[PDB]
Design a protein around this ligand. Structure first.
Ligand SMILES: *C[C@@](*)(O)[C@H](CCCNC(N)=[NH2+])NC(=O)[C@@H]1CCCN1C(=O)[C@H](N)Cc1ccccc1
Ligand code: NA
Lengths: 249, 26
């Protein structure tokens, strides 16, 4: 996260950290959507161009973690994966279309003051909140500049018009993504950055006071560059697949 | 049990920047 601020404790209890098991290495962000399900970016797990293709066994996840250096003993939880699920039509070859994956926990995690799931958008919450100019919130332990934080970083960024997103890059954008961030005219800055993928882009519903995850940090070009915008996986657009893997046989 | 934070919503307490979010809805 570039130009973000330090998260207050318990401010993003659905925050999850995807680590490489051997050796220990923080790979990406993720989010808690249930006691056994963690949502993240497909490319965090599978991306051949970078010689990336992990297996459940290769990784683990940390939750309720407030410090990367210290170990809030009875606060954070470390959970192993039981199965990874990557969207069938994830396009890593071209534009990272459908950059989404689900990770089922070996064992359920216990909710606490520091750990809780974020809500997934329903049809109408999404129809109302997904409007350019409306701000969402992005969190992550990723790069501080195009630089590693000791506290989870957070940044509130406005959703940007599709045409503006499209014209801001040569990469082919799809309906399955959306971009957010300030325009050079706007004054403020801020952006997600390498390392933050998988982390959540959330919005608070005025209707019920609850936080909903509308996007997944997916990609960008550089970080916090004027005229550029960070891209996110459109969670609602991919809700059917999420439910499918979740409710199965 | 989702979208509601024990140290915040459950306590009827706002974090420091969420009003920035609700204001953007205008
Ligand atoms: C895996 C994530 O950590 C990361 C998020 C980057 C966010 N950028 C900003 N400023 N918000 N994603 C990536 O690094 C992805 C994975 C593959 C390469 N990539 C990029 O963002 C490239 N910089 C551009 C790109 C290449 C191929 C397909 C889509 C985008
Ligand atoms: Na920018």
């Amino acid at each position: 996260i570039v130009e973000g601020s330090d998260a207050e404790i318990g401010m993003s209890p659905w925050q999850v950290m995807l680590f490489r098991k051997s050796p220990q290495e923080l790979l990406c962000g993720a989010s808690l959507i249930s006691d056994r399900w963690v949502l993240t970016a497909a490319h965090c797990l599978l991306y051949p161009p970078w010689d990336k293709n992990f297996t459940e066994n290769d990784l683990l996840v940390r939750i309720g973690k407030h410090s990367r250096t210290r170990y809030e003993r009875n606060i954070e939880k470390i959970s192993m994966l039981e199965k990874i699920y990557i969207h069938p039509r994830y396009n890593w070859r071209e534009n990272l279309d459908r950059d989404i994956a689900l990770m089922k926990l070996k064992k359920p995690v216990a909710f606490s003051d520091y750990i809780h799931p974020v809500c997934l958008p329903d049809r109408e919450t999404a129809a109302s909140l997904l409007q350019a100019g409306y701000k969402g919130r992005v969190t992550g332990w990723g790069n501080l500049k195009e630089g590693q934080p000791s506290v989870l970083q957070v940044v509130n960024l406005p959703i940007v018009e599709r045409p503006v997103c499209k014209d801001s890059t040569r990469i082919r954008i799809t309906d399955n993504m959306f971009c957010a961030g300030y325009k050079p005219d706007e004054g403020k800055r801020g952006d997600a950055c390498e390392g933050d993928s998988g982390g959540p882009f959330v919005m608070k519903s005025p209707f019920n006071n609850r936080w909903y995850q509308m996007g997944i940090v997916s990609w960008g070009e550089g970080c916090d560059r004027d005229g550029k915008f960070g891209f996110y996986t459109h969670v609602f657009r991919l809700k059917k697949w999420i439910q499918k893997v979740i409710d199965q046989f | 049990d989702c979208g509601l934070r024990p140290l915040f919503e459950k306590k009827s307490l706002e974090d420091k920047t969420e009003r920035e979010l609700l204001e953007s809805y205008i």
